Amino acid sequence: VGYTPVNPDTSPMVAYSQYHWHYNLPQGMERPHSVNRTFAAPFQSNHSLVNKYRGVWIEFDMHPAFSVALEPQLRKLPRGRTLPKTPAEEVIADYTALAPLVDDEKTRDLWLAKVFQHCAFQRCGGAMELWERYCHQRFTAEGATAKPPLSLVKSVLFYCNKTDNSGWRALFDRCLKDGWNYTPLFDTAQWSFMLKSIGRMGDEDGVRAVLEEMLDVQADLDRVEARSVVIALNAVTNADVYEFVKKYLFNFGERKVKFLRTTYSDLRGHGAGKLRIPLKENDNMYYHVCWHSSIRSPRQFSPRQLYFDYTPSTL
Amino acid sequence: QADRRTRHHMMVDGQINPREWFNWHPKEYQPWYFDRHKFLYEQRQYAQFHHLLCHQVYLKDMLHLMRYPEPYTHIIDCRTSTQKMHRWVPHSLWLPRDEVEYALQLSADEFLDMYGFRKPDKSDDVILLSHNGIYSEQAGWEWKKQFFQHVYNYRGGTNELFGESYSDMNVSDVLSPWKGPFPQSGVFVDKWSKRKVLTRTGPFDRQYEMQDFALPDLELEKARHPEEGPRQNMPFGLQ
């Protein structure tokens, strides 16, 4: 009785009533409850994971001989979680000079991959020359048999995305099932960077090819970084690719799709500053990603909105 | 300023006002998802049949079974009218949907005499086939009610196989706009306060909401509204 309701735990007139347990009965537990055991939820935090590497790990496997031999050259290149500020010109000079002296293929290529990664972080454009000078001959040209070491490919790809470069499309294509079959070994961050670059450059077709492979190779869709999905989708103006992207959008999860919308509305919105290159206007893809989000969320009832104009009829 | 649409009214024009948040059975606020882009019989209006649905068989399975048949898997054609069926799904057999209820109650012998092929045992795989995948579904419910253990419906069936566009029944997605008053069969008196209150049957029904929902293309959706914007009959705060 009142506008303030009784709280059923603290009130003995609830607790001890006939619909609950009186204090003179024997007070044991009624039934056991196993909730967590029967059907358990997987852990997904609202906050992203604080320790994760957040980059493209380039996997440095060197024989612990050349690793010691080449140390004064390698000390200038990135080691794990450490990014020395050495100017990229110098590093490339060192590779060009000293590398023909080393005899190992595997070593020369690990070293090269480090150089590429280093040049990806500084966004120096003259590093593809290195690909055409050493690797192109035995990997990409005229159906050469040789199969490049994975780390090298990851590194070059990462470089083509960081420095936006038409070249990526040629490399990526070699990684599908009939080629090197490297695509299932890519990191989630790899996909993230790829999508973002392709999106900036604006290839709907690059975007489609990449989303198809990602899906087939079972990438982690929900953990692909939202910004990069948005920038990729934003690039899609062509009727067919557009169709593809609706049908595809159904592959994300409820949550992912909600934040695809949030992120999208921010990047053309308040957070338009957050990007190094501003987005381009897609009103169509924006509207659609919002629409999709609305379709996939639970629906709420707002009767004064729906039935605002309802009039009954006696027909 | 204010009017019947905007003000609080228990009743508007002699019938319960649907605009009041408190005129609905609270159950109507519980969360639900849009159906409409899903297969016809998964939708919520068919809920009485939901316990009966059939495990699917996709186009891939169908082509595979064309080239590599299994002895005791039966592919059963449910197409009803002979006028519409010009091709033969490989290794199939014909039990038209209309006959099923009768057919499945024949003895092995009698069934042999009426349809000219052996009646599948209840262990065997039975794949059902139709134009759209609707009649095959209904037939499936029949086969499942006699208890047949493996009954698969191939939706999109003969249309996908042969690239024909035909339909088993003529049913359209659009609901005819609701005609009379709100049905007294949906009116729900409350048990504690004895208070009459609306339900989502009738002129208020989720079908109608999904039907008129915003189109999923900005251009086609902007075409639907006047220049200034989508809802201008409402006060700003109701938009």
């Binding site: 609706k246 049908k247 | 169908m62 082509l63 064309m66 799904v89 196989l161 042969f162 690239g163 999923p216």
Partner: peptide
């Protein structure tokens, strides 16, 4: 709101197979 996307074209899936055979 349906249809969300353009339905698959009329393509005939049985013919190519039985033609190969």
């Amino acid at each position: 709101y349906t249809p969300i996307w353009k339905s698959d074209p009329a393509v005939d899936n049985v013919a190519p197979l039985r033609d190969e055979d």
